Amino acid sequence: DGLNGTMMQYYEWHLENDGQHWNRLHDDAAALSDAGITAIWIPPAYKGNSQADVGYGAYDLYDLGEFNQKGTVRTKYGTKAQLERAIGSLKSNDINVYGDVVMNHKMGADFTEAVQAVQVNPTNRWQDISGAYTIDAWTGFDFSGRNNAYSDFKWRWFHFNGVDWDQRYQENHIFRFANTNWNWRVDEENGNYDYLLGSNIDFSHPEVQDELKDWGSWFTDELDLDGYRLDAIKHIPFWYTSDWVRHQRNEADQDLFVVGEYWKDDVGALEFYLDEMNWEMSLFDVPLNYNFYRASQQGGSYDMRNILRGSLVEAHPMHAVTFVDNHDTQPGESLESWVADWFKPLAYATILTREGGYPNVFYGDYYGIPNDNISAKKDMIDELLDARQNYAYGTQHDYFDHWDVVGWTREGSSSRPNSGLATIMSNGPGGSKWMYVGRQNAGQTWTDLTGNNGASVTINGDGWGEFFTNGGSVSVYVNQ
Ligand code: NA
Ligand code: NA
Ligand SMILES: [Rb+]
Ligand SMILES: [Rb+]
Ligand SMILES: [Rb+]
Ligand SMILES: [Rb+]
Ligand SMILES: [Rb+]
Ligand SMILES: [Rb+]
């Protein structure tokens, strides 16, 4: 028993469209469990716009690589049977499975429909910039191929309220359907960030509200999930996300972890959303994400004392999911804010060896991102996992007392023999620092699990030791 969980996003933007990913997941289970991974966040497992869609161009939430639709049976990751087989593997290996959930929109409509619409100011959706006129939007969904298995709900323009393309005159505009309202409440960037892309779902319709609740349960039961990764929730009316969440926990016997992706470098904005959520879920720590980014970008001059400043984990470590990067921040993607190889080791140590926050390992970092010649960091990360899995326990002591060199420690716990660790790093010239680690660990001799520093540190009578690190490096001394 015990604890210390570590989540892993098992996919990157440029994975190969060989539909063999679910299978890899299945053969990788044990290795991941053993390495310290306790939970896996899988990508949207339902049929998207096309076979090579990463998952967010969601077409049919009921087709998990089972029906021949959108030019393919399988999804980019594989067939429904292979995914169920993978999940079984993860389960028997004690890894929780969280599903990525896309409810903000739908894409790949089978046919267009005449709709009265108005163009809105892109920087202020509240403002129209054209009169109402008929446009041909792609909103008709009949799911030919599924033959109403699991559900016969058909989508139509009136279930939506906006699109960014008009097939009639063939132009791009942010179209608000006439006489419909933008969802609310939602992020106020651009005035009203309800619309992002694809066919935007309007949740005011009760039949919509139930179809997604009904689907959610179907989904959860069909895959035997343990939680969800909620996509683009800052564009989804808050009240409904909340209702939806509460609805799922109501139908499912098993516990359900919930992390929502409210993407905004602004902790307040996330706290507000969390208030509205009555803290019934966690949120990826995006400010932290950009903190790491800013640091990776600036170099040593960056004042390491403010590395956690602004983060979410800093203020509500209980509802923060920490990470360094993802498919949106990887090079070339929409939200690019990639943490360079030099700083990435420090960032991972920060979210992996500290007590606050639920850390998430990025598939791209772990196995590398070939497309962009980014090396796999399995080695650097496994050592930290070993740290987290076996040494990151007990009382914590922080030392963000210097702009370049900073560190922290964990006294270890009675329940976990030999646990205990001291993390130190510098984003500038190297240095050393005296840190407390628990008088009960006196006389022990600690060494760096990362091998970035040969120093052998001995704990004195008072429980103090002097730890070292070279420039731009991180070390995690433990009693191995
Ligand atoms: Na929306
Ligand atoms: Na510095
Ligand atoms: Rb089809
Ligand atoms: Rb329940
Ligand atoms: Rb990042
Ligand atoms: Rb200990
Ligand atoms: Rb090493
Ligand atoms: Rb030792």
TrEMBL record:
SUPFAM superfamilies: (Trans)glycosidases, Glycosyl hydrolase domain. Its cofactor is Ca(2+). GO terms for molecular function: calcium ion binding; hydrolase activity, hydrolyzing O-glycosyl compounds. Residues 5-409 form the Glycosyl hydrolase family 13 catalytic domain. GO terms for biological process: carbohydrate metabolic process. Ca(2+) 3 binds at residues 300, 404. InterPro entries: A-amylase_thermo (IPR013776), Alpha-amylase_C_pro (IPR015237), GH (IPR017853), GH13_cat_dom (IPR006047), Glyco_hydro_b (IPR013780). Gene3D superfamilies: 2.40.30.140, Glycosidases (3.20.20.80), Golgi alpha-mannosidase II (2.60.40.1180). The active site is at residues 231, 261. Pfam families: Alpha-amy_C_pro, Alpha-amylase. Ca(2+) 1 binds at residues 104, 194, 235. Ca(2+) 2 binds at residue 202. Keywords: Calcium, Carbohydrate metabolism, Glycosidase, Hydrolase, Metal-binding, Signal. Belongs to the glycosyl hydrolase 13 family. This is Amylase. It comes from Bacillus sp. KSM-K38. The gene is amyK38.
